[PDB]
């Protein structure tokens with residue numbers, strides 16, 4: 142037993158599942174053993190870039206939208222930057238904001254509803270376990286989300302997100318709700334039951350904000366998702 | 372379902388319900404006319420035409436290797452111009468071997484659409500189509516001429532319809548009709564075609580009247596009688612060709628609208644007769660963007676979305692020099708090689724010794740050459756009073772994006788920095804910008820500053836001496852006709868001067884600087900001194916020896932500024948070089 146007590150001994154509701162993400166999104170106290178440094182999806186500590194949006198992620202996951210990775214809108218930082226920088230020196234580095242998460246089944250309706258106004262700017266992709274696949278993405282084509290331009294060189298594009306790779310990743314992206322977390326609990330115990338109601342019948346989601354010279358809209362998508370549900 | 376060439380391409384438009392247009396031309400009897408018509412093919416291609424049809428006659432030697440011959444005109448339309456063509460063919464006074472040889476030659480030239488014609492004095496187009504199918508299978512498109520008001524040689528119209536049945540069922544793919552004067556005639560013979568089991572799509576042909584010779588030309592071509600209404604309209608204006616052009620445009624617009632609104636017409640064939648204005652106006656009245664180069668090439672070149680910037684003021688030589696390739700670049704340019712040098716036209720749109728009045732008959736010194744570049748860039752008339760339309764490297768008026776590089780560019784060019792290609796830094800403008808908005812309409816477009824020029828031995832030396840003060844920021848490349856090569860670019864890698872960011876797509880980089888393909892542009896760039904401007908002068912003269920000295924000893928230089936969100940340093944590097952001189 143290493144991560145059980147860090148993820149909580151007994152889950153009273155989905156709120157006890159939300160309470161595991163916020164204690165990963167900040168170093169914070171717990172009923173026993175304090176800080177948790179891991180989730181099934183998130184074996185790295187938060188990258189230094191995450192400090193730009195840590196307060197937003199804490200807000201988002203405390204509202205029940207269960208973020209499992211992100212990026213900010215960077216708009217051409219120097220390559221040498223210790224927070225957001227890579228490749229040859231002196232060049233530039235760019236990003237699109239990114240927000241990948243799970244939600245309660247009722248919340249996916251809410252998200253699709255609010256995307257009816259942002260479906261030009263925000264590339265979105267929702268998927269339930271067994272298959273229920275909704276997107277505004279180009280049918281086939283990958284979306285580039287981190288790229289860089291370097292003195293005397295070709296454009297480098299290290300981070301890309303796309304509907305085929307996402308539909309493949311989904312088959313692991315649900316399995317470890319059981320294989321890592323759910324397998325800790327007793328057979329059909331109230332914790333296992335609320336985890337199974339979170340494994341099955343629950344939407345994995347991806348969002349990308351394409352308009353990177355602007356402030357990141359993904360927080361407003363989630364705020365309006367919440368508002369709508371409310 | 373899947374789609375391919377042949378009927379499936381036009382079946383795509385049929386299913387999508389998109390109306391299209393096609394143009395049909397004639398081969399000229401002179402080489403100059405051939406060049407003019409090739410330029411015309413380039414100009415019409417932007418009108419979104421389905422295909423180009425080239426007529427065939429035996430008196431003009433169409434199967435021969437003369438440039439005026441129809442076969443080479445069609446080949447130039449496709450291979451060296453990038454436009455799909457449909458080749459007409461007639462087999463009167465021809466044998467099996469001749470037809471087979473001509474069809475094989477069409478094979479070798481990439482020609483894949485063939486029109487079957489019987490001509491006027493192998494007895495029928497049925498034999499031609501059947502022989503084509505038997506000897507070359509289904510590799511080629513086959514289309515047969517249709518006769519709505521019946522063949523003049525035929526006793527009965529129903530017999531003509533039956534012969535059309537047989538010809539279509541033999542090997543034909545599409546049917547093209549001749550001139551008309553009433554729309555209802557289209558409908559009646561279309562219904563006849565349907566009722567006889569002919570299921571191929573029928574496309575109507577249109578002759579746009581443009582002059583008084585059109586009436587005689589129309590009568591001779593179609594053997595039909597002009598209606599008394601049109602003649603009476605034309606008779607009182609028998610010497611106002613321009614007015615008849617407007618009247619014919621109106622009549623053609625009415626006919627085309629009636630044809631299209633029917634829904635049985637998938638497209639239109641227009642008999643241009645090697646005339647542009649009326650056809651273009653008609654097409655516009657009936658109702659460019661994917662890359663900063665306004666068209667990517669058609670034949671075997673759907674893959675091209677990156678090419679080197681060097682040729683971008685002169686694109687048709689790049690297409691011609693690269694026609695050997697299969698690896699037409701898509702992705703990071705990283706592969707296609709111009710391991711090539713060639714025999715040529717090297718002719719402007721102005722005649723061979725006509726533009727001498729704009730470049731000057733008499734070069735006094737290099738300081739006269741320096742004004743020809745500046746007169747071009749300024750749009751200013753020469754000492755003769757003639758505005759310079761082009762220079763040997765750049766047959767165009769230079770682009771709207773280079774209006775940002777007007778006053779500074781011509782200012783530094785006066786000083787012996789003879790610029791032949793250039794570009795602004797852009798810093799992430801929205802897509803659909805008026806001067807740099809290429810690609811998908813949502814997104815952003817980005818560019819580095821670029822400058823390319825010839826310059827003197829002294830000024831090149833100076834610049835080599837200076838660039839050390841910017842060499843972290845400026846990639847530079849310098850070469851001469853002697854092959855002396857000096858450059859500061861990493862491992863000779865390409866340099867991505869333009870790119871765009873678009874929702875849901877990977878990053879797109881449509882133009883690139885490349886120090887290896889600059890070795891292949893170099894030879895073309897220097898040779899365009901002697902082979903267009905030197906040879907425009909007499910064989911031993913001040914003007915020839917001046918141009919041969921410029922060819923012999925100027926450096927060719929290219930610079931790129933990598934700090935694209937900051938102000939351009941190419942302005943304030945050549946000025947940092949002018950200072951040093953003194």
Ligand SMILES: Cc1cc2nc3c(=O)[nH]c(=O)nc-3n(C[C@H](O)[C@H](O)[C@H](O)COP(=O)(O)OP(=O)(O)OC[C@H]3O[C@@H](n4cnc5c(N)ncnc54)[C@H](O)[C@@H]3O)c2cc1C
Nearest residue numbers: 426427459461488489490495496516522524525534547549
């Ligand atoms: C779109 C178009 C393009 C043209 N292009 C050219 C060109 O490139 N070069 C050129 O020289 N001319 C061309 N012409 C002119 C054309 O070739 C003439 O109309 C010519 O006189 C006959 O050619 P055809 O294919 O229409 O002949 P066909 O369709 O074969 O018709 C000619 C006559 O053959 C008779 N016939 C056909 N099959 C039979 C049969 N099985 N049994 C008995 N009788 C039969 C018909 O009754 C008809 O009157 C073109 C015409 C059109 C409309």
Ligand SMILES: Nc1ncnc2c1ncn2[C@@H]1O[C@H](CSCC[C@H](N)C(=O)O)[C@@H](O)[C@H]1O
Nearest residue numbers: 183186187188191198208209210211287300
């Ligand atoms: N549950 C969670 N909520 C928010 N962010 C998370 C998260 N789990 C991981 N992350 C962060 O999401 C980031 C995605 S990393 C992939 C993109 C990468 N930064 C690049 O541009 O190359 C990680 O760096 C990590 O710090």
Ligand SMILES: Nc1ncnc2c1ncn2[C@@H]1O[C@H](CSCC[C@H](N)C(=O)O)[C@@H](O)[C@H]1O
Nearest residue numbers: 663683684765769770790791792793869882
């Ligand atoms: N004599 C001359 N001096 C300066 N620039 C010239 C020139 N002749 C042509 N040019 C310009 O050279 C540029 C090269 S193409 C520039 C790159 C490309 N348009 C892009 O897609 O980003 C053209 O804009 C052309 O107009």
